[PDB]
Amino acid sequence: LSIAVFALGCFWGPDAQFGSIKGVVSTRVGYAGGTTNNPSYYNLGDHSESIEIQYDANVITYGELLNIFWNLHNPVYETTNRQYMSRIFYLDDGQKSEALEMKRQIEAANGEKIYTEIVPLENFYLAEGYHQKYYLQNTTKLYQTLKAIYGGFGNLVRSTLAARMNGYIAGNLSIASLKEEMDLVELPEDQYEKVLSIVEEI
Amino acid sequence: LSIAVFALGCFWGPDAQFGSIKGVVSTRVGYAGGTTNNPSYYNLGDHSESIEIQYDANVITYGELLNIFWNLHNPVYETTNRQYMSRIFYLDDGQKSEALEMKRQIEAANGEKIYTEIVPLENFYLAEGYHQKYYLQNTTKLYQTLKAIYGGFGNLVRSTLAARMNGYIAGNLSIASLKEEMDLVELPEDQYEKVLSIVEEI
Amino acid sequence: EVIVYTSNTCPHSFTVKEFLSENNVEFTEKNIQTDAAARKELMKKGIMAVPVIQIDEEVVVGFDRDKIEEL
Amino acid sequence: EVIVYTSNTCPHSFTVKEFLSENNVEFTEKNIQTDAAARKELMKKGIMAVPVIQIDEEVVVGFDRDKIEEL
Amino acid sequence: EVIVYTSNTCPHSFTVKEFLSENNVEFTEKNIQTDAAARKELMKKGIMAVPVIQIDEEVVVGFDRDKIEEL
Amino acid sequence: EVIVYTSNTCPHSFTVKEFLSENNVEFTEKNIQTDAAARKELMKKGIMAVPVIQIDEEVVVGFDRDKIEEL
């Protein structure tokens, strides 16, 4: 179980996409890259909107997560808008190596220089609770059903099933693979069909 | 649904082997090749011990049945023992053509002349009831269970399940494929587990 | 409309064909060991995308959940 | 001892791998699109002996009884 | 003439896109996760593999580097 | 050096035996329906295909005529 920290614009999309990936165990959205303590959504400072991905390394590689990272946005433009900058926060020198190598390869393969910045991770601060699993949290029916099942907002948003559900609500996940992850969760059958009834209503 | 008629020695073995073949719908053992009416086991005359195979042509070819035929015995010796001679009784000119062609091919490929005789089918007479599904009929437990299920000796021995069971008892059929054919029969579940209980006792 | 891509291996091609014919489902059979075109068409399907799980010795083809559970 | 023969296709290889890892089953992964030896070893298994059933458009790999029933 | 069926949640789609552009190969991209027409077109083609590389008549499923190089 | 795993209830076993003898190829036959040692040896080799043509290190599964010709 390893950790990656990316930033590729507003983090709702990154959350809903990376949380649909098999091998991603959990996701959090937050702020990282600035020089201020506990930034808030309307008080980011120099921070960037970021996603922290906890992934099973036996299923997906850091390099494959980087493939997906550069597959979700094309940072061939240089902005000074720090809230939406494209950054890779590396937790060790292996992540730094892989990211620099892949960035060089993209720059050479497409002829466009890449403005994603590879920087060391200092502090990743959590975003407000209303930003976590944003799409799922706004389908109040299924949201509160799953929250009652998992017994709390914190237990919910920190789970793999919540990431997959937030992705499926955003249209980034097949319903079949949602069923597969629900099988992985091993719900006590009654909650299982309740959840499936709610998800197929959409 | 087509008919083939072979003779390759004592017909217990041929029955138990051909009745294990997927695509074979039913099998009967009897006498064919002589000039006498209604021969009996101790009164064959010039008849040969033969097997009549009813096979689904969508699953297995007459030529594939011939492959199996020459794969169950090697008639490179000429005998005048008509009870056990190697013969192919053809029902139409297509069977005659295929059999003659394959016999030529075997003779050329192995350098040994083949003494199987390709002759037209006149009359195939049934053998006594105690020769039909001989191995299954002698496992009295499973035999009478299946006979009560199929409601009579005639309905039993004329069935695909009986051919597969007689083959499995003779060790010519995987237990898995016996389960597959039993699934094909669609037993009313209780008789199903009764039969499986009896077959796995062996 | 049904197509069965078969081989020159007698356990399972005949199993599928007997199942289909016994249920009166009419199908056309393409033998991928004697029809190169049939095998090239089957390869145009995502057939090498199916995973295979080797458990010490036995082989499970595709994600057959219950089978893999039993080993 | 478990081996998973994988591909460069993201739906199902990751499905099998997530299932195995979540159940704490340790396995070694051989990618048959990047390891020619792995694909030659998988071909030494009866992998071309598995039949494939095409129902008008969809593809069933192996004799998946219930799946074929539903189409 | 090249067409590439890809998806957002697939590393291999990105890798083969990078391969094609690194080898200066003009190609059409049909991202099946946002182009519903493209995904249903791929759906009733028999495939469910992602990424798919259609080279005018041939079909490469996944990032088979050596096979794609052969063209 | 050739070994051929065959069975009685298999047309393709007979056809490949005839092919090998028609091409004057000395081979060893292991009929897995009567040689229990041979069948269990084949069983924990991963295969369940019948017939299997082991050419000293390579493995041909089924009567792939063109592949067997390549040796």
XYZ file of C-alpha atoms in Angstrom, chain E residues 7-56:
50
model
C -10.274 5.482 -22.138
C -9.365 7.920 -19.382
C -8.878 5.286 -16.656
C -6.364 3.216 -18.674
C -2.566 3.553 -18.483
C -2.036 1.479 -21.627
C -4.183 3.812 -23.736
C -1.818 6.634 -22.782
C 1.265 4.483 -23.376
C 0.217 3.455 -26.889
C -0.799 7.034 -27.740
C 2.685 8.113 -26.646
C 4.191 5.266 -28.688
C 2.325 6.301 -31.843
C 3.234 9.981 -31.483
C 6.844 9.104 -30.578
C 6.966 7.186 -33.867
C 5.261 10.077 -35.728
C 2.090 8.141 -36.575
C -0.997 10.209 -37.341
C -3.967 8.536 -35.674
C -7.603 9.153 -34.777
C -8.553 8.899 -31.099
C -11.979 7.652 -29.972
C -12.101 7.993 -26.174
C -14.878 5.544 -25.295
C -15.334 7.057 -21.820
C -16.574 10.387 -23.224
C -17.589 9.562 -26.839
C -20.695 7.405 -26.425
C -20.952 6.790 -30.175
C -17.375 5.489 -30.215
C -17.962 3.245 -27.206
C -21.143 1.667 -28.587
C -19.446 1.221 -31.973
C -16.664 -0.645 -30.171
C -19.259 -2.420 -28.010
C -21.070 -4.169 -30.841
C -17.774 -4.993 -32.538
C -17.277 -7.917 -30.135
C -14.378 -6.290 -28.292
C -14.248 -5.097 -24.692
C -10.517 -4.664 -24.282
C -9.384 -0.988 -24.297
C -7.130 0.221 -25.876
C -7.867 -1.032 -29.418
C -5.619 -0.117 -32.357
C -7.492 -0.515 -35.652
C -4.988 -0.381 -38.512
C -7.450 -0.019 -41.448
